[PDB]
Design a protein around this ligand. Structure first.
Ligand code: HEM
Ligand code: NAG
Ligand code: NAG
Ligand code: PIW
Ligand code: MG
Length: 225
C-alpha cells in the first residue's frame, strides 16, 4: 500500500527523490512520459514544491530527452552523463567507474561518514559534498564538473535539507536522509510530513548560498562554487 519497487520494464534516474516519487506513484511508476503538468502535480502533491520551481526543474529535465525540444522526459534520460548527471554524487559512482544511476554503497558510506550527528546541518551537508568533489578529482582521471553540474551539486545538498527537513533552521534528521537514499521511499514512519509552506526557487537559492558560505578552503581546488 503506497509504494512498489520498480520492475524489469520501469526506468529510474540518478535522482533519489524522483525515483522515490515514481516508487510511490506521484510520478508514473514506470518512470516514463513525464510532462510539465505531471511534474508540477507530483512535486506539489508529495513535497509542496511550488509550480515555478517545478517548471524550472522540468525545463532542465526535458534537455536530457534525446528527442530535441521535447515536452516530456523519462527518468533514465536524466542518467545521461554530463547533461544534468555529474561526477562527485553523494550516493552514485562517477560514470567513469560504472553506472552513475543506481545507489552505490561505497560512495554513500563516504557521504554518511561526514554526517556526524543525528541532525544534519548546513555545515555537515557542505562538508560531505566537498569531500566528494575532492575524492572524485583525485580518483577519476575523467573527472569533470560543468557550471551547470556545480549548480546542481550545490542545489542537491540544499534540496535534501530544505525539502525533506526544515528550511528555516536549515536542518534535517540524518535518519530521514539515509532512509530516502537507501530505500527510495519517503520516511513518513520516521517522522517526515509534507510541509504546509511551499518550497520555492528563492528557498533553494537561500540554502545554496548557505552551503557555499559553509565552505572554508584556504585556497579552492577547482570547481567548488
Ligand atoms: C523535476 C525535478 C528534478 C530533477 C529534474 C532532478 C534531477 C536530478 C539529477 C539529474 C540528479 C543527478 C545528479 C548527480 O549526478 O548526482 C539529481 C540528484 C539529486 N536530486 Fe534531484 N531532481 C529533481 C527533483 C528533486 C527533489 C524534489 C529533490 C528533493 C529532495 C531532489 C534531491 C536530489 C538529491 C539529494 C540528489 C543527489 C543524489 C546524489 O548526489 O547521489 N531532486 N536530481
Ligand atoms: C559500507 O559500510 C557498511 C557499514 O559499515 C559496511 O558493512 C560495508 O561493507 C561498506 N561498503 C563498502 C563497499 O565500503
Ligand atoms: C581538479 O583539481 C585540479 C587541481 O586542483 C583543478 O585545477 C581542477 O579545476 C579540478 N577539476 C574540477 C572539475 O573541479
Ligand atoms: C538546479 C539545482 C539543483 C537541482 N536539483 C536539486 C535536486 N535535484 C536537482 C536542479 C536544478
Ligand atoms: Mg552523478
Amino acid at each position: 500500500s503506497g509504494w512498489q519497487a520498480p520492475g524489469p520494464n520501469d526506468v529510474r534516474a540518478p535522482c533519489p527523490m524522483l525515483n522515490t516519487l515514481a516508487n510511490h506513484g506521484f510520478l508514473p511508476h514506470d518512470g516514463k512520459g513525464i510532462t510539465v503538468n505531471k511534474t508540477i502535480d507530483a512535486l506539489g502533491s508529495a513535497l509542496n514544491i511550488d509550480a515555478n520551481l517545478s517548471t524550472l526543474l522540468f525545463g532542465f529535465a526535458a534537455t536530457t530527452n534525446p528527442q530535441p525540444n521535447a515536452t516530456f522526459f523519462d527518468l533514465d534520460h536524466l542518467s545521461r552523463h554530463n547533461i544534468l548527471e555529474h561526477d562527485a554524487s553523494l550516493s552514485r559512482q562517477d560514470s567513469y567507474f560504472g553506472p552513475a544511476d543506481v545507489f552505490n554503497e561505497a560512495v554513500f558510506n563516504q557521504t554518511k561518514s561526514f554526517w556526524t550527528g543525528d541532525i544534519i546541518d548546513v555545515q555537515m551537508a557542505a562538508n560531505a559534498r566537498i569531500v566528494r568533489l575532492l575524492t572524485s578529482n583525485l580518483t577519476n582521471p575523467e573527472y569533470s564538473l560543468s557550471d551547470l553540474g556545480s549548480a546542481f551539486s550545490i542545489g542537491e545538498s540544499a534540496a535534501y535539507i530544505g525539502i525533506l527537513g526544515d528550511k528555516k533552521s536549515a536542518t534535517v534528521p540524518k535518519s530521514w536522509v539515509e532512509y530516502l537514499f537507501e530505500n527510495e521511499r519517503l520516511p513518513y514512519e520516521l517522522g517526515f510530513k509534507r510541509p504546509n509552506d511551499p518550497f520555492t526557487t528563492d528557498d533553494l537559492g537561500d540554502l545554496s548560498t548557505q552551503i557555499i558560505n559553509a565552505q572554508h578552503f584556504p585556497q579552492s581546488p577547482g570547481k567548488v562554487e
